[PDB]
């Protein structure tokens, strides 16, 4: 069965775990879920083909050891997540993309820009800002709510379709 190794990255508190848990377990994150780094797995059907998603929900310390670089190099595609009410999380996106490009030694890595928490009303990053940044990188922008499930499948499946083609 075809396996896709997806990696979810972004600032503290943006909803990396919530997006992953919603995709895999069909509900929202809570006070009992893992806050150490962990991986999830689920067999799904995308465009009529069965495949297995292996999702790395990142956590822990920021560090640039050879081991950490090499480990991240193994991810096949990245969701770069910010929260639409957290401008600093959005301004950090360039940092995550820079590290992905550095370890993959390539500008052509499957990636999706995810603006999470779209259910909130108090938005401080507007859609045009996020679209502009996504267009500057040549990556899709998908607005999500891990709480209501809006956009969640589209975000992960878009990343899969990018990897699937990139492998062909
Ligand atoms: C989980 C750890 N984490 C991470 N924080 C940061 O930066 C946090 C901020 C705020 C402080 C100063 N620093 C710089 C900037 F200002 C933003 N960068 C991270 C990062 F670049 C990666 C990464 C991604 C893709 C890759 F190819 C590689 S390769 C490699 N060696 C990586 C590393 N490390 C890495 C990862 C990883 F690996 F999990 F995906 C996690 C990162 C937490 C630390 C506390 N955090 C926070 O938001 O505090 C406010 C977030
Ligand atoms: N309103 C709203 N809150 C969300 C959403 N996703 C996550 N949150 C909230 O944001 C906080 C962090 O969510 P979590 O998924 O743990 O974020 P994380 O990016 O995994 N944080 P960490 O880097 O510490 O592991 C929690 O209070 C959670 O309820 C969302 O779509 N909508
Ligand atoms: Mg945290
Ligand atoms: Mg988390």
UniProtKB/Swiss-Prot annotation:
Cystine pairings recorded for this chain: none
Subcellular location per the Swiss-Prot or TrEMBL entry: Cell membrane; Endomembrane system; Cytoplasm, Cytosol
Annotated SUPFAM superfamilies: P-loop containing nucleoside triphosphate hydrolases
Effect of residue 14 to I: In NS3; affects activity and impairs responsiveness to GTPase activating proteins; characterized by a strong increase of both intrinsic and guanine nucleotide exchanged factor-catalyzed nucleotide exchange leading to an increased level of the activated state
Known outcome of mutating residue 5 to N: In GASC; found also in a patient with Costello syndrome; exhibits only minor alterations in its in vitro biochemical behavior compared to wild-type protein
PTM remark: Acetylation at Lys-104 prevents interaction with guanine nucleotide exchange factors (GEFs).
Impact after mutating residue 34 to L: In NS3; characterized by a defective GTPase-activating protein sensitivity and a strongly reduced interaction with effectors
Residue numbers carrying N-acetylthreonine: 2
Keywords: Acetylation, Cardiomyopathy, Cell membrane, Cytoplasm, Deafness, Disease variant, Ectodermal dysplasia, Glycoprotein, GTP-binding, Hydrolase, Intellectual disability, Isopeptide bond, Lipoprotein, Membrane, Methylation, Nucleotide-binding, Palmitate, Prenylation, Proto-oncogene, Ubl conjugation
Gene Ontology biological process terms, A to Z: actin cytoskeleton organization; cardiac muscle cell proliferation; cytokine-mediated signaling pathway; epithelial tube branching involved in lung morphogenesis; female pregnancy; forebrain astrocyte development; gene expression; glial cell proliferation
UniProt motif Effector region: location: 32-40
Membrane topology of this protein: Lipid-anchor
Impact noted for substituting residue 38 to A: Decreased interaction with MAPKAP1/SIN1
Phenotypic consequence of residue 22 to E: In CFC2; exhibits an increase in intrinsic and guanine nucleotide exchange factor catalyzed nucleotide exchange in combination with an impaired GTPase-activating protein-stimulated GTP hydrolysis but functional in interaction with effectors
Consequence of changing residue 40 to A: Decreased interaction with MAPKAP1/SIN1
Effect of residue 13 to D: In GASC, JMML and OES; also found in a breast carcinoma cell line; somatic mutation
Annotated effect of mutating residue 60 to R: In CFC2; characterized by a defective GTPase-activating protein sensitivity and a strongly reduced interaction with effectors
N-acetylmethionine: residues carrying this PTM: 1
EC numbers, comma separated: 3.6.5.2
Principal location listed in the UniProt entry: membrane
Family indicated by similarity: Belongs to the small GTPase superfamily. Ras family.
Record note on quaternary structure: Interacts with PHLPP. Interacts (active GTP-bound form preferentially) with RGS14. Interacts (when farnesylated) with PDE6D; this promotes dissociation from the cell membrane. Interacts with SOS1. Interacts (when farnesylated) with GPR31. Interacts with RAP1GDS1. Interacts (active GTP-bound form) with both SHOC2 and PP1c (all isoforms) to form a tertiary complex; SHOC2 and PP1c preferably bind M-Ras/MRAS, but they also bind K-Ras/KRAS, N-Ras/NRAS and H-Ras/HRAS. Interacts (GTP-bound form) with MAPKAP1/SIN1; inhibiting K-Ras/KRAS activity.
Function summary: Ras proteins bind GDP/GTP and possess intrinsic GTPase activity. Plays an important role in the regulation of cell proliferation. Plays a role in promoting oncogenic events by inducing transcriptional silencing of tumor suppressor genes (TSGs) in colorectal cancer (CRC) cells in a ZNF304-dependent manner.
Disease: Leukemia, acute myelogenous: A subtype of acute leukemia, a cancer of the white blood cells. AML is a malignant disease of bone marrow characterized by maturational arrest of hematopoietic precursors at an early stage of development. Clonal expansion of myeloid blasts occurs in bone marrow, blood, and other tissue. Myelogenous leukemias develop from changes in cells that normally produce neutrophils, basophils, eosinophils and monocytes. Leukemia, juvenile myelomonocytic: An aggressive pediatric myelodysplastic syndrome/myeloproliferative disorder characterized by malignant transformation in the hematopoietic stem cell compartment with proliferation of differentiated progeny. Patients have splenomegaly, enlarged lymph nodes, rashes, and hemorrhages.
Protein name: GTPase KRas
Organism listed in the record: Homo sapiens (Human)
